[PDB]
Amino acid sequence: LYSLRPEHARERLQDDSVETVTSIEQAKVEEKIQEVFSSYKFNHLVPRLVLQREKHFHYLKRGLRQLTDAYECLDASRPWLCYWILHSLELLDEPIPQIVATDVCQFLELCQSPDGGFGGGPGQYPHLAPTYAAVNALCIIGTEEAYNVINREKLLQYLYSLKQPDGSFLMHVGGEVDVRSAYCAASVASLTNIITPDLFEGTAEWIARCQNWEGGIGGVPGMEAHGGYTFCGLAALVILKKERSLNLKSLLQWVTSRQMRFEGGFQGRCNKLVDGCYSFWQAGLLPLLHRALHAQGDPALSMSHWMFHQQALQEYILMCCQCPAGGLLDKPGKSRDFYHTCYCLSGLSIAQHFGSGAMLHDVVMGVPENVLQPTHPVYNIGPDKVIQATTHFLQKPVPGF
Amino acid sequence: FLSLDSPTYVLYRDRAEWADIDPVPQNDGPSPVVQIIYSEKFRDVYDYFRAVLQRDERSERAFKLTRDAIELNAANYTVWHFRRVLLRSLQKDLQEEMNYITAIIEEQPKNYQVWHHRRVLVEWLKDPSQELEFIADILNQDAKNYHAWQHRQWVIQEFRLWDNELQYVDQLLKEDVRNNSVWNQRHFVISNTTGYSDRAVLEREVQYTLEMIKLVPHNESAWNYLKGILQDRGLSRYPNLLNQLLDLQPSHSSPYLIAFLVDIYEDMLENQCDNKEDILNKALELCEILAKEKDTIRKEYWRYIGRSLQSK
Ligand SMILES: N#CC1=C(c2cccc3ccccc23)CN(C(=O)Cc2cncn2Cc2ccc(C#N)cc2)CC1
Ligand SMILES: CC(C)CCC[C@@H](C)CCCC(C)C[C@@H](O)P(=O)(O)O
Ligand SMILES: [Zn+2]
Numbered sequence: 213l214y215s216l217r218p219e220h221a222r223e224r225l226q227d228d229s230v231e232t233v234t235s236i237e238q239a240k241v242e243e244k245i246q247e248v249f250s251s252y253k254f255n256h257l258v259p260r261l262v263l264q265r266e267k268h269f270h271y272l273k274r275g276l277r278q279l280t281d282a283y284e285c286l287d288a289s290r291p292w293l294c295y296w297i298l299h300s301l302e303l304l305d306e307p308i309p310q311i312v313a314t315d316v317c318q319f320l321e322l323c324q325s326p327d328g329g330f331g332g333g334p335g336q337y338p339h340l341a342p343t344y345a346a347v348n349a350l351c352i353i354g355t356e357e358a359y360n361v362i363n364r365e366k367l368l369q370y371l372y373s374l375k376q377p378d379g380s381f382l383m384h385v386g387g388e389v390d391v392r393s394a395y396c397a398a399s400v401a402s403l404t405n406i407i408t409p410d411l412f413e414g415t416a417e418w419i420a421r422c423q424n425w426e427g428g429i430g431g432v433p434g435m436e437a438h439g440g441y442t443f444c445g446l447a448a449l450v451i452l453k454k455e456r457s458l459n460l461k462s463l464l465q466w467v468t469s470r471q472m473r474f475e476g477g478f479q480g481r482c483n484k485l486v487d488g489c490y491s492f493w494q495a496g497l498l499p500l501l502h503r504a505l506h507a508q509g510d511p512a513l514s515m516s517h518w519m520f521h522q523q524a525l526q527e528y529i530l531m532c533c534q535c536p537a538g539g540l541l542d543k544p545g546k547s548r549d550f551y552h553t554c555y556c557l558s559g560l561s562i563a564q565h566f567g568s569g570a571m572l573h574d575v576v577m578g579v580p581e582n583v584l585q586p587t588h589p590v591y592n593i594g595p596d597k598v599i600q601a602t603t604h605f606l607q608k609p610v611p612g613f
Numbered sequence: 614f615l616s617l618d619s620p621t622y623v624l625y626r627d628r629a630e631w632a633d634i635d636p637v638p639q640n641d642g643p644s645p646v647v648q649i650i651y652s653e654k655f656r657d658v659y660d661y662f663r664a665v666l667q668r669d670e671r672s673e674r675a676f677k678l679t680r681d682a683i684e685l686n687a688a689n690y691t692v693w694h695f696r697r698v699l700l701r702s703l704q705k706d707l708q709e710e711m712n713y714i715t716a717i718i719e720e721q722p723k724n725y726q727v728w729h730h731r732r733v734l735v736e737w738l739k740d741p742s743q744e745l746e747f748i749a750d751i752l753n754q755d756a757k758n759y760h761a762w763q764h765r766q767w768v769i770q771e772f773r774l775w776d777n778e779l780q781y782v783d784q785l786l787k788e789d790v791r792n793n794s795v796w797n798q799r800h801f802v803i804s805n806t807t808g809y810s811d812r813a814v815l816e817r818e819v820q821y822t823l824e825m826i827k828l829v830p831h832n833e834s835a836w837n838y839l840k841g842i843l844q845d846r847g848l849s850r851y852p853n854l855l856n857q858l859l860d861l862q863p864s865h866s867s868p869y870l871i872a873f874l875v876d877i878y879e880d881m882l883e884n885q886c887d888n889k890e891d892i893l894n895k896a897l898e899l900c901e902i903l904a905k906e907k908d909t910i911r912k913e914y915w916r917y918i919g920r921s922l923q924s925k
Contacts, residue, residue, distance in 0.1 A: 223910070226831040226867065233756070234791035278648045284655050288689045293647035315644040322642055334640050335663065336691045386694055388729040390763075425800050425841035431759065434766050436797040438759065462844075464914070469833070473910040482793045483834055484757070512920035519913045 213259060215249050215476055215527045223474040234483055241485050244544050245475050248532050261530040261578025263560075264538065268553065269306050271538030272297050275550055276312065288332030288339075291323055291346035296554035298352050302594055303557045303584040313353040320346045321361045327373070328366030338370055339384040340396035347400040348593050351601040359604055368406045368611045371397050379414030380432075390431040394419050395444035398451040399591055403598070405605040408612065416454040419445045426482065427462030437466060439480040439494040446500050447590045455504040464505075467497045468519060476524030477532070477543075487542050488533040488552050491559025492592065495520055499562060499589035506568065516573035522563045526577035529556050529563075561587050614677045617654070617684050624654070625661045630674065636660035637667050655685050666695055671702040680713075687717065693726045697733060707734055715747060722751050728760045732767065741772040749781070756785060757794045766801060778802050790825055796834045800841065809842050818842055823857065830865035840873060849880040868908035875899050875918065882922075897922055 214220065225242055227235045252259045276297045286293060294316050301308060322334040323346060329338030330346040350358040374381040374393065381393035394415055401407045421433035422445055428437020429445035446463070449455045470478045470490070477486040478494035498518040506513050533540045533556045539548030540556035561584040566573045576583040588595040615622060625631045638660045641648055651659070662682045665675040679696040682689065700710060711734055718727045735741055745768065751761045769775055782799045785792055809815050819842065825835040840848075848854060855877050861870055878896035882889060897919050904915035 228829040228831050230790070230829045230832075232789040232791050234789055276646055278645070278650060281650055281652050281655065283649045284651055284686060285688060287649055287651075287686050288691070290647055297647065312646070315642070315646050318642050318644065319646045322640065331691065332689070334642075336689075337694060339690060383725075384690060384694075386697065386733075387690065388725060388732075424797065425845075426797070426837055430797075431763055432766075434770070434801050435763050436759065436794055468911045468914040469837075471910050473908065476910070481757075482837060483791045483832075484793075510921075511924050512917050514913065514917065517913055519911075519917060521910050521913065524910060 213261070213527055214521070214523045215531070216252065216259060220474070225474065237485060238483075241543060242474055245486075245532060248544055251531075261527065261582065263530065263579070263582040263584075264534055264536070265304055265581070267536070267538040268300070268540070268557075269304055269538075271535075271548075272300050272304075272306070272550070272553065276301075276316075288336060289342065289345075290333040291320060291330050291342040291349060292332075293550055294320065294349040295345040295352070296550035298349050299587075299593060300550070300554050300557050302352050302597075303561055303587060305585050308353060313355070314357065316349060317353065317355075317358045317361050320350060324361065324363065325370070326366070328363060328368070328370030337384055339387065340374065340381065340393050341383060343367075343370075344396040344399055347403060348591065351403060351591075351597045352593050354597050354600050359601065362404055364404050364406050364605070364608065365611045367400065367404060368408070368411075371401055371406070371411065375411075377414075379412075379416075379418035381415075391419060391422055391429065391441045391444040391448070392431075395448040395451075398448045402451050403591065403601050403605065405602065405608060406611050408610055412452055416449055416452050416457045419448055420457040423458050423463065427459065427464070427466030429458075429463075436481060439467075439470065439478065439490050439497075442467065443493040443496055443500075446497055446504075450500055450503065450590050455500070456508070460501060460504055463497075464501055464519065467494055467501070470494045471520055471525070472528075475532075476521065476528035478525070485543070486528070488529060488540060488559070489542065489555040491525055491529055491533075492555045492562060495525055495559050495562050496589050496592070499567070502568065513568070515568050515571045517566050517575070518562070522566075522575045523577065525563045526560060526575070529560050530577060530582065557584060558587050558592055560584055562589065617658075617681050624657045625678070626657055631661065634661065634664050634668070634670075637663035639663065658682050658685055662692060666691075671699055673703060675699060676703060676705070683717070687721050687724050688726060690726050693730055697730070707738055710734060711738075711743065715743075718747075718751065719754075722755065722758050723760060725760070728764050732764060735768070741768045741774060744768040744772075745774065745778075745781075752785070756789060756792055759794075762794050762798065766798075769802075770805075775802065775806050779806075786825075790829055791832045791834055793834045796838045800838065809845075815842070827861060827865050830861070831867045831869070833869060836869040836873065840876065844876070847880055847884065848877045849884050849886070855881075868903055871899050871903055871907055875903070879922070882925075893922065 225239050298308065323330045323342065325331055325338040327338060329343040331338050332342050347362065350361055373385060376389065380389045381397050382389050383393050401411060422429045424430055424437055426437035429442040430436050430438055431441050446455065449457055472479060472486045475486045477488060478490040479486055480490050498520050502513060502518065532544055535541055535548040540553045541548045542552055564574050564576050564583055565586050586595055587593065588598045591598050626636060658681045661678060665678060676699045679692050682692045714727060714731045714734065718731060721727055735744065748761050748765045751758055769778060779802050782795050782802060785795045803809060807814050809818065819839060822835050822839040843851060858870060858873055875896055878892050881892055886892060900915050900919040904912045
C-alpha cells in the first residue's frame with residue numbers, strides 16, 4: 213500500500229520548529245492516522261482493504277426510513293437526507309424498492325413549494341440547497357413519477373425570484389448569497405431543461421470573481437479559496453459551458469495542492485485538516501478539469517488517470533473514514549453521518565474510475581468488491597441518471613414566457 | 614419569557630396563554646421517509662409554530678416562540694424568516710435583537726442563517742459600529758471561521774472601514790503565520806486599498822513574505838501569497854527572484870522552493886530567454902524530482918507539467 217510503505221513516513225509534517233495552532237492540530241491528525249496505518253504491523257495480519265458494504269447498506273437502509281432525535285438539527289434538510297442515502301445506496305449498487313421510491317417521491321412532493329422549488333421539509337419555504345437535493349433524488353429514482361413531481365414552470369419562476377443583478381442568486385427569498393446558489397440553480401435548471409436565454413445572465417462572470425489569488429474559488433468575491441465552493445463554481449461553469457472564464461492553470465495547481473501528502477485525502481482550504489467529504493468536493497475537480505483542459509485541446513493530459521493520487525485517496529477512505537457499524541466519516545474519531553457517507557463514497561468512486569473519451573482505467577483498491585457504481589462529476593449522481601433525466605425533460609419545451 | 618432549559622419549563626400544549634390555538638402537526642405523509650423522531654419538546658414547539666405561522670399570527674407570543682423554535686433548530690431558515698417579519702411588523706427594538714443574534718452566533722458560529730440574520734439587522738440599522746469587535750471575538754475562538762471572515766469583508770467593503778484592518782491582519786499573522794484566512798485577508802485589504810502596483814508596496818510585501826518563508830520554509834500560505842502577488846506581472850520580470858530563492862535551496866528548502874522555481878522557469882520560457890534549452894532541462898529535472906522523490910502525492914500533476922513543458 214502506498215501509505216503503509218516506509219518512505220511515506222517522510223511525508224510527515226515539517227514543523228520548522230516554529231509551531232503554531234495549525235502545526236499542532238495537523239500533527240495531531242497525522243499521529244491518529246499513523247496509528248491506523250500501522251494498525252496492521254502491530255497486530256500481525258495481512259492488510260485487507262474492504263468496503264463494509266453490507267454494514268453500510270444496513271445503516272443507509274434504516275436512515276431512509278427514520279432517524280433519532282439526534283437528527284433534529286437537519287430537520288430543515290430532509291431532501292438532503294433522501295439524496296445522501298439514495299445516492300450512497302446508488303453507489304453501493306443497492307436496491308431502491310418500487311414502494312420506497314414512491315414514498316420518497318410523495319414526500320418530496322410535500323416539500324415542494326407552490327411557488328416552485330423545495331423546502332427542507334413539509335411546509336418549509338423553498339431553498340436552493342433542498343431544491344438541488346430533491347431534484348437529484350428524483351433523478352436517482354428516475355421514473356415518470358419521480359420526474360413528474362418536479363414543477364418546471366414553477367421552478368423557473370422561483371429561480372428567477374432569486375436572481376441578482378450582479379449575476380448571483382439568493383439561496384432563498386430573504387436569504388444569503390454565495391456560490392452554492394449558482395451551482396444549485398444551474399444543476400436543477402439544466403437537468404429539468406428550464407434554462408432560458410437570460411436566466412444565468414452574468415452568472416459566469418460573478419462566479420469568476422470568486423476565484424482569488426490562490427487559484428481557488430471562494431464563497432463570494434474576495435473570500436478564501438474553499439473546496440466546497442470551488443466545486444460549486446467550477447461545476448457551475450462546466451454546466452454553463454464557461455469553465456474558460458477562469459484561470460484553469462492556477463485552479464489546477466491549487467486543487468492538486470489540497471491533497472495531503474501524508475494522509476492521502478484532501479483538505480478544504482490551504483493549511484486546514486483532511487476531511488473525508490472533500491474526497492469529492494476537491495477530488496471531483498480534476499475530472500471536471502480534465503474535460504475542461506482537453507476541451508481546449510490539451511496534449512499533456514493522461515489517458516488513464518486523474519491529476520491526483522487515486523491510490524492514496526482510496527487508502528485514506530478505506531482505511532481511515534469507514535465506520536465499523538456502518539457509515540463513513542470525516543476522519544478517525546469523528547462521528548458518522550449520511551453526508552460524509554454520501555461524500556466519502558462519491559470520492560472513492562471518483563478515485564476508482566477514470567475516463568477520457570473511450571479510455572477507461574478504473575483503479576480499485578483492495579477487495580475488487582470495493583468498486584462502486586460511477587458518479588457524474590458535475591451532478592454527483594450516476595452518469596446514467598443524468599443522461600436519462602436531461603433527455604426526458606428535453607422533450608418538454610423550456611418554460612418560455 | 615420561559616427558557617427551554619428552565620427546570621420549570623412547560624409544554625405549549627400545557628400553557629394557559631396558548632389554548633386558543635390548535636397545534637398544527639407536521640404532515641410527512643401516510644408513509645414517511647427520513648422521518649425524525651422528535652422529542653415531545655421539539656414536536657410541541659413546532660406543532661405550535663406550524664399554527665402561528667399558518668395563521669400568520671404576527672404576535673408577540675408568536676415572536677417569543679420562534680425563539681424557542683430557533684433554539685431547537687437554529688438551522689431552520691423558515692422560522693428565521695418569519696422572525697424577521699415579526700421584527701418589522703411588531704416593530705421590535707433591533708439593537709435588542711442585535712444582542713440576541715450576538716449570543717446565538719457565539720453558540721453556532723458556523724450556522725448560515727445566524728450570520729445572514731445579523732447582516733440584515735446591520736443593514737436595517739445602517740450601523741457597522743459593533744461588527745469588527747464582534748467578529749474579532751469570534752475569530753478569537755476560531756481564527757478561521759469562514760462565515761466570520763466573510764461577514765467581516767462585507768462590513769469593511771460596504772461601510773468602507775479599511776483603515777485599521779491591515780494592522781489586524783498583522784496581529785493575527787503574528788499569532789499563527791500559517792493562518793491562510795489572514796494571508797487571504799491581507800490580500801483582500803491591500804488589493805482594495807493601495808494595490809500591489811506601487812513599487813514600494815510590492816517590495817515591502819515580497820520582503821515580508823520572503824521573511825515568513827525564510828522563517829517557516831514549509832508553511833505553504835506564505836509561498837502561495839508570494840507567488841500570488843508576483844505571478845500577476847510575471848515572475849520572470851524579477852531577475853533577482855530566481856537567485857534569492859536559489860540561495861534558499863539548502864537553507865530553507867521544501868518542495869515549495871522547487872515548485873516555485875519550476876514556476877519561474879515556466880515564465881522565463883513563456884517570455885523566451887537565452888539558455889532556454891538548459892532552463893527547460895533544469896525545470897524538467899525539478900519536475901521529475903518533485904514527481905519521483907520530492908512530492909509524489911501529486912506525481913500525476915508533476916509529470917503533466919513535465920509534458921506540457923515539452924509542447925510549450
Ligand atoms: N451531514 C452532515 C453535516 C452537516 C450538513 C447537513 C446538511 C447538508 C450539508 C451539506 C454540506 C455540508 C454539511 C451538511 C453540517 N455540519 C456542519 O455544519 C459542520 C461542517 C463539517 N464539515 C463542513 N462543515 C461546514 C458546512 C456546514 C453547512 C453546509 C451547508 N449547506 C456546508 C458546510 C456537520 C454535519
Ligand atoms: C452544493 C453544496 C451545498 C455544496 C456545499 C459545499 C460545502 C461543503 C461548503 C462548506 C461551507 C463552509 C464555509 C464551511 C466552513 O464552515 P468549514 O471549511 O469550516 O467546513
Ligand atoms: Zn467533512
